Amino acid sequence: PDQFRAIIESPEGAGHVGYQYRRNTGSTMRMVSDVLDERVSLWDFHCDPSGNVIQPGPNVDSRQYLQAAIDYVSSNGGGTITIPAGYTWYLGSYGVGGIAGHSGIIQLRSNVNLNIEGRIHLSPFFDLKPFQVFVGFDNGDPASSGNLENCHIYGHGVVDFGGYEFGASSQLRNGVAFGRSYNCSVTGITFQNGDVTWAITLGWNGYGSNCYVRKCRFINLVNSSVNANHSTVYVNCPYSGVESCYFSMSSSFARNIACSVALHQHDTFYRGSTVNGYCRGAYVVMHAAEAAGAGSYAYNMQVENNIAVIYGQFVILGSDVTATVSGHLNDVIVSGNIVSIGERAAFSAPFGAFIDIGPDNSGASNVQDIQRVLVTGNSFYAPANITDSAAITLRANLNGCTFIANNFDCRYMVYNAPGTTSPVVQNLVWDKSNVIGGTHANQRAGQNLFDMQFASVVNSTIEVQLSCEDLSMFSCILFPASCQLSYSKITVDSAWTKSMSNTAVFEGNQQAGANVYVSYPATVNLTSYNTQGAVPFFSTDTNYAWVTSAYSLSINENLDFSPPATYTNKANGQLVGVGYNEIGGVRSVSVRLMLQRQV
Amino acid sequence: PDQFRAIIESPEGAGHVGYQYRRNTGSTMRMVSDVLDERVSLWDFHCDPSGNVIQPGPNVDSRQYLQAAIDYVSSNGGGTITIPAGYTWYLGSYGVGGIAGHSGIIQLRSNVNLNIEGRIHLSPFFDLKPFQVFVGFDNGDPASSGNLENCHIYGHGVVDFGGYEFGASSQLRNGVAFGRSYNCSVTGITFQNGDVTWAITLGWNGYGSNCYVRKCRFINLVNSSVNANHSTVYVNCPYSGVESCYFSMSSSFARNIACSVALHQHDTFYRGSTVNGYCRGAYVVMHAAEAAGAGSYAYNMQVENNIAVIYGQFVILGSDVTATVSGHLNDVIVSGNIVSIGERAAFSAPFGAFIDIGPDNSGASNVQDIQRVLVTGNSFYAPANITDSAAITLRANLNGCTFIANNFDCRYMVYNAPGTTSPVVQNLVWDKSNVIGGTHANQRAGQNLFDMQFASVVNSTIEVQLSCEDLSMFSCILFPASCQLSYSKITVDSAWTKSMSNTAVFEGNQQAGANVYVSYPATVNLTSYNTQGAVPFFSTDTNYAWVTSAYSLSINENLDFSPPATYTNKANGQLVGVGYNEIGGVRSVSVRLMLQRQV
Amino acid sequence: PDQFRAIIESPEGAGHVGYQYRRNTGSTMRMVSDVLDERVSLWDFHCDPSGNVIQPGPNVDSRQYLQAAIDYVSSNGGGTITIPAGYTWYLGSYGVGGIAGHSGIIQLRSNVNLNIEGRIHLSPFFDLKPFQVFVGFDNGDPASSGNLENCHIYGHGVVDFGGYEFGASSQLRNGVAFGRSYNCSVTGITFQNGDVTWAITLGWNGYGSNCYVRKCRFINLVNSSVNANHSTVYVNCPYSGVESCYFSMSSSFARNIACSVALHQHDTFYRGSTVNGYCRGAYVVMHAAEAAGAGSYAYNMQVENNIAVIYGQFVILGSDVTATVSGHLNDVIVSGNIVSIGERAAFSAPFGAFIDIGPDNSGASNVQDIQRVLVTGNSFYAPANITDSAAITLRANLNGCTFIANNFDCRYMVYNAPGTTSPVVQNLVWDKSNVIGGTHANQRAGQNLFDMQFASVVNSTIEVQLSCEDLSMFSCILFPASCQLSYSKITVDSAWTKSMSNTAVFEGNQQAGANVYVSYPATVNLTSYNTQGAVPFFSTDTNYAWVTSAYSLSINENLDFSPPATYTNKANGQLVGVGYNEIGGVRSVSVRLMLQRQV
Ligand SMILES: CC(=O)N[C@@H]1[C@@H](O[C@H]2O[C@H](CO)[C@H](O[C@H]3O[C@H](CO[C@@H]4O[C@@H](C)[C@H](O)[C@@H](O)[C@H]4O)[C@@H](O)[C@H](O)[C@H]3O)[C@H](O[C@@H]3O[C@H](CO)[C@@H](O)[C@H](O)[C@H]3NC(C)=O)[C@H]2O)[C@H](O)[C@@H](CO)O[C@@H]1O
Ligand SMILES: CC(=O)N[C@@H]1[C@@H](O[C@H]2O[C@H](CO)[C@H](O[C@H]3O[C@H](CO[C@@H]4O[C@@H](C)[C@H](O)[C@@H](O)[C@H]4O)[C@@H](O)[C@H](O)[C@H]3O)[C@H](O[C@@H]3O[C@H](CO)[C@@H](O)[C@H](O)[C@H]3NC(C)=O)[C@H]2O)[C@H](O)[C@@H](CO)O[C@@H]1O
Ligand SMILES: CC(=O)N[C@@H]1[C@@H](O[C@H]2O[C@H](CO)[C@H](O[C@H]3O[C@H](CO[C@@H]4O[C@@H](C)[C@H](O)[C@@H](O)[C@H]4O)[C@@H](O)[C@H](O)[C@H]3O)[C@H](O[C@@H]3O[C@H](CO)[C@@H](O)[C@H](O)[C@H]3NC(C)=O)[C@H]2O)[C@H](O)[C@@H](CO)O[C@@H]1O
Ligand code: NA
Ligand code: NA
Ligand code: NA
Ligand code: NA
Ligand code: NA
Ligand code: NA
Ligand code: NA
C-alpha cells in the first residue's frame, strides 16, 4: 500500500507498471521502463546533481550532459542518442582527456550515433578561440589514437558556429573530426554561421574507411580576414566521399581562401553537389605527409556531376614528397560537372581554371607525379572580362591528363604564366571533340589561346578546333623557343581561321622535329615558271623544309591558269607543286594553304 | 490513497509515474509522460471533443485532427508528427484561412515534419473538384505569403488521390505545395491514383531555396481527357532538385500532356530518375513571369543520368518575356541520359525529340535567349516507323547549343517543320563524335537527315558522320534558299556515301559564302585535252566556283592514263587538275570527288 | 485498492495509466500502453512460454521470436520492427512452410519493415549447409508464390554470415531474397563474413518492380574453393537497381568467381558504387529463362559513375534462348565509370576487359541479340604486364556497340582469341575520340592492337588514333583472311606511326571491297620517267588497285626534283602521280604515304 504509491512515484516506478504489446498474449510480459529504455535522448542526462532536468539555453552549458550520454550508451555497446527538436542546445566549455589536444568539445564514441533534430550552438566562450566540436580521436596524438567505428550523425538539425571570428590565423576550427574513422557518416545536417577551417574531416592520414557526407548543407563558414584557409570537407581515408551536398559562402574572404572538398586518399569521390561563393571546388592530391594509413598513391579519384560557381579553380591536382615518401596521383576522372567563374574583375581572385595542376604547398613544381587523368563531358564558362580564366592552368610537372568532349568557354584553353615555373609536360591529350566557346572572342589581343609556357612537351596531342572567329588573338597555339617539343601531334583545323595572320607558332621552329606531327593554315606567296601547259609554282620564301604536303584553301579567280591543288617541298625549303598554264606566262599568287607535316 | 488511484487513471497519471533511464543513477529523474512527450503522432490529436480517440476510415474526415497536430507542434518550435502505419487516414473537407485561396486541405508549418508511414487517401468529397493536399503558403495571395522553412515529409507511406477525375480543365490539383519554401523536402513517399496538375511543387516564382524530392514514386497521376496539363514536379526555387525518383503513367492522356519535371530557376537539377509513359521528360525554362525571387536568368541547369520512355520530347528548353522582364536560359548540361520514344504510330503524340527548342506558351519563336547548353554522352532511340523523331527539334530562336559524343538513333538529326516558324540560329555545334544510328535506314524517302528549316544559321558547325548506308534519304543535310548561312562549318564525311546522289544541298548556293567552310562528296564528269604526258582534266559543268580543292574518291580502272588525284578551280566555275596520259587522247571520266571549300 | 495494485503490476497495467500529450487539453486522452503500442521491437516477442524475456546470445536461437514478431505485425497491416542496437541476435534453425523450399530462415511479409540496428549472426548450425536468411516467397515453388510488397530493411546494423564455408558447390546461400517483390528495399545495412552465392536478390524471373539496394556494404562474402559462383546483388525485376553501395572482397577465390551486380530485367541500373577485389563488375544480360514476368527484352540498362578494381571484366553483356523464348538486350548505357584491373600476373584470372560480349552459359556464341549499346566517357587501366587486358573482348555475336570518348589504357583495344569462337559482328562503332593510352607501349611484340578475330564484320567503324609510339606491336589493326569485311570504315591516323612497318593489315585483301572505306599509312617505292619538267612517278609494286588517292607524309630532301604530292592509281595496281624534274633523269624514291580508299 504505502510501499506501492511510493515505488510508483519513485524513479523505479515505471519498472513496476506492466506492459504487453497490443495486449498480445504471445508477447513478452515487460514493464513500462523496459520499453522506454529502447530509446534515449539528451533529456535523460541533461540534469543537475539531484537528477532534476535542466532546460537548455544560452546560459546553460550542455557539454557535460551530452558527453555523459555518449559515454553511457557507449558502455552498453552503442545506440542512437536523440538531440531533441524544438530546442537549442548550447556548448560552452572544452572537453577533457584525449580530445583536449584537438581543442575538442565533445568526444564521439564507437557505435554511438547522434540523431540531431534540434540545434547545437556555440556559446561566446569560444569567440576568438580554436575548437573542434565533435572529435573521434581518443588521444591528443593521432598516431597513438584508437579508432572510431560505426558512428553516424544524422537528422534535420543544425550545428551553428556562433558567427565568431578566428582569433589568430594559426588556430584551427572544425565541426566533426571523425579521427581514425571506420564506417562513419554525416547525413542531413546543416552546418552554418562560422569562421572555420573545416566543417567535417574524415579519417587521419590514410587510416579509416567507408566514411561519407551526404545531403548536408554548409552555409557561411568563412567570415574573416584572419581565417587562413578553409576546406569544407577533408577526406583523409579511402573508400569514402561526399554526395548530394550543398555548399554556399557569401564572404569576400571565401572567394580567395575556401574550397568545398579535399579528396586525399584512394577510392574517394565527390558527386552530385552544388557549390556557390567558393574560391575552389575540390583538391585531388596525394600528400606524402599523409601516406601512412593507405599507401603513397591516390588513385580512383572521382569528381562527377557537380554544379559550381567558384572564383578560382574548380579541380586542383597535386602530389608531393617528403624525405622518405613520394606521393603519386593517378587514375582520376572528372566528368559531368557544370562550372562557372562568378562575376568578378580580372585578377581579383586566384587565377580562374577548370583544372589546375598546382605546385606543392612550398611552391615546388618539380616533385609531382600526376597521370592517367580523364577530364570528359564537362562544361565551363567564365565571363568575357575575366582575363585570368583557363580550361587548364598547367603550373607544375605533369605526367598525363586527357581531355575529351568538354565544352570550355573562357579566355585560355591551356595556360601557364611565362617567366614563372617551367613544367615538364608528358601525355597531355586535348582531343578534337573539346568545343572552344566564343564568349571571349575579340578580347584576346596579345594572347595565345593555347599558351604553351613549358620546359618541354612530349607525347602530347593538341587538336585545335574553333567554333567561331576570334581575330583578336595573336595565335591559336604558341610554343616559345625555350619549350622543347617532340613526339607530339599539333593541329589547327582551318574553320574560322582564314583571316588569321598566325595560327600555330613555333618560336624555335620546333615543328621540324623528326617525330612532330603538325598541320595548320598559312598564307604563302608563289611564283611560276612561264611555260605553257603543266607548270611548276614555287614559294618565294624558303621556310618550308619541314612540310610534307600542303593543299589549297583558296579559290582560283583566274581563267588562264590555275596554281597547284597540292604541294610538296624542296631541300632549300621552298614549296613546289604542278599547276597549269592555259596560256603561258610567269604567274604570281598569294594562296591560303593547309601546311602538313607527317599527317 | 483515493487521490492516488484517481490521479493514476487520469490523463495526468503518466506524469506521476517515475522513470530513470536504464536505472542509471546519473540520469535524469523523469516521469513516464516526459518520455512519451519526446514523440508525437496523429493519434494524439485524432479524438472527439471529450478526448476519446476516433478510428480513421472512409467515413471519418481526419483533416481537422491532422491540422490540430501540426498547429500544436508548430507552437513548440517544431518536431516530427508520425502518421501511423497499418491505417488509412482519409481527408474529406477543405482547410480554412490562408490556404483556402489554394484549394488547400492541410496547412504545413515551419519545422514541423511529417513522417508518413500509413496512407493518406482523398474521400469522394473531392471528386470533380480542385485541391492541393498540403500547402505551405499562409496567405491566399502568394505575394503576401510568409515562408515555409525546414519542413520535411518522408516515410514509406502513400498519398492516394482517390482516382477522381478533374471536373473542369481550368481546375488545379496538387499533392504538396511547399510555397515560399526554404530547406523543405519529400523523401520516400508514393503518390498514386489521380488526375492532378502536379504532385509536388517547390518554391514560388523564385522565392525559396534547398528544396528537394528524393526516392519518391509517382504512379498514375493523369487519368482523364479533362486534365489540361501535368508536370509531376515543378521546381520554382533555386538550389533545388529531383533525384532518384520513379515516374510512371499508363493513361493514353499522359502520353500527350504529362511531363515528369519542370526546372524553372537557377542551380536546379534532375538526376538518376526513371520515367515511363509520359509525353515529356523535363522542361528547362526561364519564364519572365516567374523571375521575382531569384532573377531573370535560369543557369546551372542539370539533367543527368536518367532513364526514360516518353512519347514526345525528352528535354524542352525555353525562355520568354513580359512587358517588363526578359527571361534568359544559359549554362545547361544534359548528360548520361538513356531515352527512347515508346512504341507508337507516327504522329500519334507530340513530335518525338531528344531536345526541343520550343516556342513560348503563346507560340512566339522570337523571344527566346537560350545559349551555352551542352548535350553530351546521351543515348536516344526511336522505333523505325516513327517519322516524327529528331535528336533536336529546333523550333524557336537559338543562341547556342553544343552536342558532343551522343548516340542518336531516330529519323532526323536536326529538324524544323518548313512553312512553320523560321528560327534565327547561332552557335549550333554538332561535333563529329555524335554517332548517327541506323534504325531508320531505308525509311527516309523524301527526307533530309539534317533539315535546316531556319531563317538563318551563323557560327554553327555540323559535322555529319554516317555509320551505315541509307540511300533512301534525299540528302544528309539541306539548306533551303530562304535560310542564310554564314560563318559556319558544314562537312559530310564520305563513309557510306558513295552511292548517294545528294550529300549536302544548298538550295541557295549558300556554300559560296566568304566564311563558309564546307566539304562533301559529289560526282563530277571531267574531260581532258588530248596531249600525251602531263595533261589537264576539266569539269564539264561550271558550278564549282566556290571549290578550293577536291580530291578523288574513285579508283582508276585505266592503264593508259590517270585523271588528277587533286583539283583546284577556275574563274568560270570549272574544276581543273593535272593528270597523266601515257598515250595521248581526249579522255572522258566520271569520278566521285571530295569537294572542299576552305578546309 | 487491491484490485488496483494488482492491475498496475499486471501486463495490463500500462493500459490503466492515463496520458495526454504534453498536458494539452485538446489532445487525446490515452493510456500509456497506447503510446507504447506505436512502436514495436524484437524484445516484444523474444520471450519464453511464460512471457519472460530471453537475452540473445550465441546459445539462443532468435529465429522463432523474430518470425512471431513479423507474423503479428503483418496481421495488423504492417509496421516497422526494430532489431535493437547493442545486441547480437543469433539465428540457429531453418524456418518452416513456404520458405523451406528455399532453405529459408526468416519469412518476410508485406508492409512489415525491419529496422536492423543491432547485429544478426548465423550460428554454427548453418556451417556447410545452404541457407537464405530472409525470404519473401511464400511457396516452395516461386511460380506458385504470392507477392511481397512494401517491405524495407534498413538501419546501421549488420548481417554476419558466420564465416562458414559452403559444404558443396551445388548449395545456394543468400542474405535477402525478396521474391516476387514490389516496392522493397535494403538501405544502410552491412553484409559481411561469408561464403555465399548472393547477398541480395530482387524479384523473380521478371516479376516485381521498384526494388532497390542503396548505401549498403558487402564485405568478404566469398571465402572458399567450394563456392561455385557469386553475384552480390541479382536484379531480376524491372524498374529496380543498386546505388551508392560499397563492395569488397579479399579472397583469392573472389578474383575468379565473384561479380558485384547482375542486371537482368529492363529499366535497371547500377550507379555510384565502389568495388574492390572482385572478378567482375556487372552482368547485363537477358536470360530467356528469366523472361516470364516482364518480357523477353532487357532494355534501359544503366551502369554509371562507378569505381572498380576488378580482376576479370567490368561489364559483361549477354542474351540467350530457350526452346520457346528468345532473349534480347538493347538500349544500354555504360558511362562515367573509372575501372582498373588490379595487380596480377598475366593470365592468372579471367581475361581482363572493360566490356565483354560473352557467350551463353553453355558456351554458345551464336544465340545473342545485343545491340544499341553506348559506352562513353569511361576510363580503364590495366598494368603493363597484363597481356590479357582489352577494352572489349568480343567473343560472341554482336548486333551493335558504340564507343565514344573513352580513355582505354590496356594491352588490346578490340580482342578475340583466334581459333576460338568466330563472332558475327555488326555495327561496332569505335569513334576517333577514344583515347588509346601508352602503359603497354613496348609490350606488344607479336600482337595486333585491334585483333579482329571474327567471322565477319559489317556496318562497323574503327577509327584508330594513337597518342604515343608503340613500335613493338605487329599492327594497329589486323583482319585475318577468314574475316569478311564489308560496308565499313577503317582508319589509322598517321600520328606516332611513321616508323611502323605495318599499320593496318588485311590478310585477305578485304580493303578492296566495294563499300569498304579505309585509310592508313604505308611506305612505297616509286620510280619516275627521265623527262625534264612535269614527270610521272609510279610505284614499283602493283598492290594498290584499291587505292583511290594517296598523299605524301615524307619531306623531299632533293633540290633537283620533287615527287608528286598526291597520287591516284592505274589498272595494273600501280600508283601514279605527277612530280617535277627541274633537271631530267630517272628518279627513285621511298616515301611514306597516306593510302586512301573512298575517303
Ligand atoms: C584547410 C585545408 O584543409 N587546406 C588544404 C591544405 O591542407 C593543409 O593545410 C591545412 C591548413 O588548415 C591543414 O594544416 C593544418 O592542420 C594540420 C592538422 O591539424 C593537426 O592535426 C589534427 C589531426 C589535429 O586535430 C589538430 O589539433 C592538429 O594537431 C596541422 O598539422 C598543420 O600544422 C595545420 O597547418 C592540413 O592538415 C591536414 O588536416 C587534415 C584534416 O584535419 C588531417 O587529416 C591531416 O592529418 C592534416 N595534414 C597534415 C599534413 O598534417 C594540411 O594538409 C592542403 O595541403 C591543400 C592541398 O589539398 O589544400 C588546402 O589548402
Ligand atoms: C502543369 C504545368 O506545370 N505545365 C507547365 C507550364 O506551366 C504553366 O501552366 C501551368 C498549367 O497548370 C501552371 O499554370 C496554372 O497555375 C498557375 C499557378 O496557380 C496559381 O498560383 C498558385 C501559386 C496557387 O496555389 C494556385 O491556387 C493558383 O492561384 C495559374 O496562375 C495559371 O493561371 C494556371 O494556368 C503554371 O503556373 C505555375 O505553377 C507553379 C507551380 O504551382 C507556380 O510556382 C508558378 O507561380 C506558376 N506560374 C505562373 C506564371 O503563374 C504555368 O507556368 C509551363 O509554362 C511549361 C513550360 O515549362 O511547361 C508545362 O506545360
Ligand atoms: C551467382 C550468380 O547469380 N551467377 C550468375 C549466373 O546465374 C545463374 O547461375 C546462378 C548460380 O548460382 C543461379 O543458378 C542457381 O540458382 C537457381 C535459382 O535457385 C532456385 O530458385 C530460387 C528462386 C530458389 O530460392 C532456390 O531455392 C532455387 O530453387 C537454380 O535454379 C540453379 O539451378 C542454380 O544453379 C542463377 O539462377 C537465378 O537466380 C536468381 C537469383 O536467385 C533467380 O531470380 C533466378 O530465378 C535464377 N535463374 C534461373 C535461370 O533459375 C542463374 O541464372 C548468370 O547466368 C550469369 C550471367 O549474368 O552471371 C553469373 O554467373
Ligand atoms: Na592537436
Ligand atoms: Na588519361
Ligand atoms: Na626547355
Ligand atoms: Na489561388
Ligand atoms: Na555549349
Ligand atoms: Na532568311
Ligand atoms: Na528451391
Ligand code: NA
Ligand atoms: Na549504340
Ligand code: NA
Ligand atoms: Na568468315
